[PDB]
Scaffold this active site. Structure first.
Site, PDB file in Angstrom:
ATOM      1  N   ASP A 144       0.414   5.465  -7.537  1.00 27.89           N
ATOM      2  CA  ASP A 144       0.005   5.629  -8.938  1.00 27.89           C
ATOM      3  C   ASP A 144       1.062   6.464  -9.615  1.00 27.89           C
ATOM      4  OD1 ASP A 144      -1.857   5.437 -11.131  1.00 27.89           O
ATOM      5  OD2 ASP A 144      -3.048   7.135 -10.436  1.00 27.89           O
ATOM      6  N   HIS A 192      -5.208  -5.387 -12.641  1.00 28.57           N
ATOM      7  CA  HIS A 192      -5.365  -4.157 -13.440  1.00 28.57           C
ATOM      8  C   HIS A 192      -4.210  -3.798 -14.293  1.00 28.57           C
ATOM      9  CE1 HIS A 192      -6.538  -0.130 -14.470  1.00 28.57           C
ATOM     10  NE2 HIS A 192      -5.549   0.389 -13.775  1.00 28.57           N
TER      11      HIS A 192
HETATM   12  C1  HEM Z   1     -10.013   5.355 -10.808  1.00 26.73           C
HETATM   13  C2  HEM Z   1      -9.491   4.688 -11.814  1.00 26.73           C
HETATM   14  C3  HEM Z   1      -8.134   4.099 -11.775  1.00 26.73           C
HETATM   15  C4  HEM Z   1      -7.302   3.720 -10.769  1.00 26.73           C
HETATM   16  C5  HEM Z   1      -7.627   3.817  -9.300  1.00 26.73           C
HETATM   17  C6  HEM Z   1      -6.134   3.194 -11.313  1.00 26.73           C
HETATM   18  C7  HEM Z   1      -5.010   2.756 -10.607  1.00 26.73           C
HETATM   19  C8  HEM Z   1      -3.775   2.300 -11.126  1.00 26.73           C
HETATM   20  C9  HEM Z   1      -2.620   1.935 -10.363  1.00 26.73           C
HETATM   21  C10 HEM Z   1      -2.529   1.856  -8.878  1.00 26.73           C
HETATM   22  C11 HEM Z   1      -1.690   1.543 -11.246  1.00 26.73           C
HETATM   23  C12 HEM Z   1      -0.316   0.961 -10.957  1.00 26.73           C
HETATM   24  C13 HEM Z   1       0.841   1.935 -10.776  1.00 26.73           C
HETATM   25  C14 HEM Z   1       1.240   2.617 -12.058  1.00 26.73           C
HETATM   26  O1  HEM Z   1       1.887   2.008 -12.912  1.00 26.73           O
HETATM   27  O2  HEM Z   1       0.915   3.822 -12.205  1.00 26.73           O
HETATM   28  C15 HEM Z   1      -2.239   1.741 -12.551  1.00 26.73           C
HETATM   29  C16 HEM Z   1      -1.588   1.505 -13.763  1.00 26.73           C
HETATM   30  C17 HEM Z   1      -2.118   1.687 -15.064  1.00 26.73           C
HETATM   31  N1  HEM Z   1      -3.395   1.955 -15.361  1.00 26.73           N
HETATM   32 FE1  HEM Z   1      -4.833   2.459 -14.023  1.00 26.73          FE
HETATM   33  N2  HEM Z   1      -6.237   3.133 -12.663  1.00 26.73           N
HETATM   34  C18 HEM Z   1      -7.409   3.743 -13.003  1.00 26.73           C
HETATM   35  C19 HEM Z   1      -7.882   3.932 -14.287  1.00 26.73           C
HETATM   36  C20 HEM Z   1      -7.340   3.565 -15.480  1.00 26.73           C
HETATM   37  C21 HEM Z   1      -7.883   3.642 -16.770  1.00 26.73           C
HETATM   38  C22 HEM Z   1      -9.255   4.185 -17.064  1.00 26.73           C
HETATM   39  C23 HEM Z   1      -6.982   3.186 -17.688  1.00 26.73           C
HETATM   40  C24 HEM Z   1      -7.055   2.964 -19.158  1.00 26.73           C
HETATM   41  C25 HEM Z   1      -8.203   2.709 -19.820  1.00 26.73           C
HETATM   42  C26 HEM Z   1      -5.787   2.870 -16.943  1.00 26.73           C
HETATM   43  C27 HEM Z   1      -4.575   2.388 -17.473  1.00 26.73           C
HETATM   44  C28 HEM Z   1      -3.460   2.083 -16.687  1.00 26.73           C
HETATM   45  C29 HEM Z   1      -2.154   1.750 -17.335  1.00 26.73           C
HETATM   46  C30 HEM Z   1      -1.817   1.703 -18.771  1.00 26.73           C
HETATM   47  C31 HEM Z   1      -1.302   1.546 -16.259  1.00 26.73           C
HETATM   48  C32 HEM Z   1       0.159   1.113 -16.294  1.00 26.73           C
HETATM   49  C33 HEM Z   1       0.332  -0.369 -16.403  1.00 26.73           C
HETATM   50  C34 HEM Z   1       1.782  -0.750 -16.567  1.00 26.73           C
HETATM   51  O3  HEM Z   1       2.496  -0.142 -17.338  1.00 26.73           O
HETATM   52  O4  HEM Z   1       2.162  -1.638 -15.764  1.00 26.73           O
HETATM   53  N3  HEM Z   1      -6.068   2.953 -15.601  1.00 26.73           N
HETATM   54  N4  HEM Z   1      -3.583   2.113 -12.490  1.00 26.73           N
END
Ligand code: HEM
Length: 484
Positions: free
Chosen positions: A191, A329
């Protein structure tokens, strides 16, 4: 005009470095004493300039083979709409979500909850059902350093004494995970990889990192569409969204094990691993499936110069989910060319967010693994910043993650696209919520049979248990509006 990095709180641009972090949620009990105490607090706040100076100093010491010091923990502060009101700061900040507050907005976000008439109560831990006026948060390398700095701040506001000017609602602690998985969230996925680059701040964007104007993150800087509507004091503040997100790890692992992708040549174990990767958009290592769709590439994962250089090409208009489901996601939360390419050629800079998450909770225990059930609380202290919750966090959650027809609905708005006929991406399976807690499905996970859906287990993998929307003001805003 150049950004005044001395005027911006350091978690917004830069980010507070941490192994551990405490979020101290408070109510203001004596306004004028609070403002007097604030004068003594403000010189402790870490700025973006401070972040840069500290990081250079640590690097230089390492180059010089000097032993490391105990870093002082760093502190930032943010205020809710209720807290602004309590303090008599009544200027409208032009963000409906912030003004509503998260406890009411959580109904539209899709949080579990109940209703008595029009009044929604989310199913949150009790303290987050109380009015919260602000958060003081302290990040550092160890519990001792954070606790020392937090005690010093509490002392300024007289917490726990008969001369307090604030009171504790509650506090939460985050801790990175052990060992080599320290930056992996509790489901196992690296992450923190992909963030927007910010013009006038990020001087060397990474390959594939499109820079955006600073006003998409900071109020009243270039690119803030609401700048004229906002008060001068709001310049160089940002909206902090906090979500207390519990994760159901054994449950997620059981799901994957129970639904291996059946693809010639894969074992059940490999099919389950591929499913996880396809639901997230990356292998656990961080390698993006868009670049490496068949198997993990740990070397790619570890290279910041390569691990984010993809845009989804024209796969959406082609109806092609072979490399990456539409509902993965990362694709649900940053659509890349799905929206920026033809047909829409949309500008989605206002949908970008900067995330500063930290994990919480212990590792999964042997008994939990045996039982395939959660017995201990663990998850993510989700924090993100932008200059608009309405455009960013809220929109992402409601309009993208929770929207089973997104992104098909968005692109077919412009013209018929026959390869997308009948395609229903489904929910973001990590964070997508269905109002009322009904049945969620995700399609496109099997590369050979995109039309098949998996119906998700009724227990959601991520369970919100608290949250609030805050505004992190600039240093001169704190001195002039929050202090005497
Ligand atoms: C427990 C909750 C969550 C987990 C386990 C999770 C996990 C991840 C992981 C593994 C990534 C991909 C690696 C990275 O780019 O950092 C990611 C990307 C992202 N997540 Fe989450 N996430 C969570 C909650 C959220 C929430 C609540 C939001 C927004 C409402 C969010 C928005 C994003 C965004 C904007 C990215 C980057 C996407 C990109 O630029 O490719 N995430 N998330």
């Amino acid at each position: 005009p150049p950004l005044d990095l001395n005027n911006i709180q350091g978690d917004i641009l830069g980010g507070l470095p941490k192994r551990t972090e405490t979020y101290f949620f408070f109510d203001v009990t004596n306004v004028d004493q609070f403002k007097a105490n604030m004068a003594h607090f403000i010189p402790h706040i870490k700025t973006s300039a401070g972040i840069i100076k500290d990081r250079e100093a640590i690097k230089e010491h390492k180059r010089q083979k000097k032993p490391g010091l105990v870093p002082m923990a760093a502190v930032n502060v943010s205020f809710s709409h209720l807290g602004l009101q309590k303090l008599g700061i009544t200027d409208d900040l032009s963000d409906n979500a912030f003004t509503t507050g998260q406890r009411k907005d959580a109904e539209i976000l899709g949080d579990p909850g109940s209703k008595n008439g029009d009044a929604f109560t989310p199913a949150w831990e009790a303290p987050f059902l109380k009015d919260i006026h602000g958060v003081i948060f302290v990040a550092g390398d160890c519990h001792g350093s954070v606790n020392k700095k937090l005690d010093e701040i509490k002392h300024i506001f007289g917490v726990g004494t008969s001369h307090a000017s604030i009171s504790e609602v509650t506090h939460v602690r985050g801790d990175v995970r052990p060992g080599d998985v320290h930056a992996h969230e509790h489901f196992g996925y690296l992450d923190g990889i992909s963030h927007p680059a910010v013009e006038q701040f990020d001087q060397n964007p990474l390959p594939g990192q499109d820079p955006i104007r600073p006003g998409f993150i900071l109020a009243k800087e270039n690119g803030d569409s609401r700048a004229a509507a906002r008060p001068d004091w709001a310049k160089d503040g940002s909206f902090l969204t906090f979500r207390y997100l519990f994760q159901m790890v054994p449950e997620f692992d059981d799901f994957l094990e129970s639904n291996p992708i059946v693809l010639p040549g894969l074992s059940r174990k490999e099919g389950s691993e591929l499913l996880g990767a396809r639901i997230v958009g990356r292998w656990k290592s961080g390698a993006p499936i868009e670049i490496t769709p068949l198997k993990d590439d740990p070397k790619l994962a570890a290279d910041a110069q390569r691990n984010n250089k993809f845009d989804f090409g024209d796969s959406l208009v082609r109806g092609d989910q072979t490399k990456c489901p539409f509902a993965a996601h990362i694709r649900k939360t940053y659509p890349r060319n799905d929206l920026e390419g033809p047909p829409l050629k949309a500008d989605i800079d206002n949908r970008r967010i900067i995330r500063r998450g930290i994990q919480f909770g212990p590792e999964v225990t042997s008994q939990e693994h045996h039982d395939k059930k959660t017995h201990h609380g663990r998850g993510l202290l989700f924090v993100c910043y932008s200059s608009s919750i309405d455009d960013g966090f809220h929109f992402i959650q409601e309009s993208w993650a929770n929207a089973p027809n997104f992104p098909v609905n968005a692109v077919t708005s412009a013209g018929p696209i026959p390869p997308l006929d009948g395609v229903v991406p489904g929910f973001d399976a990590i964070i997508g919520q269905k109002v009322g807690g009904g049945i969620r499905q995700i399609s496109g996970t099997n590369p050979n049979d995109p039309t098949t859906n998996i119906t998700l287990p009724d227990q959601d993998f991520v369970v919100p248990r608290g949250g609030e929307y805050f505004f992190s003001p600039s240093i001169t805003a704190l001195k002039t509006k929050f202090a005497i």
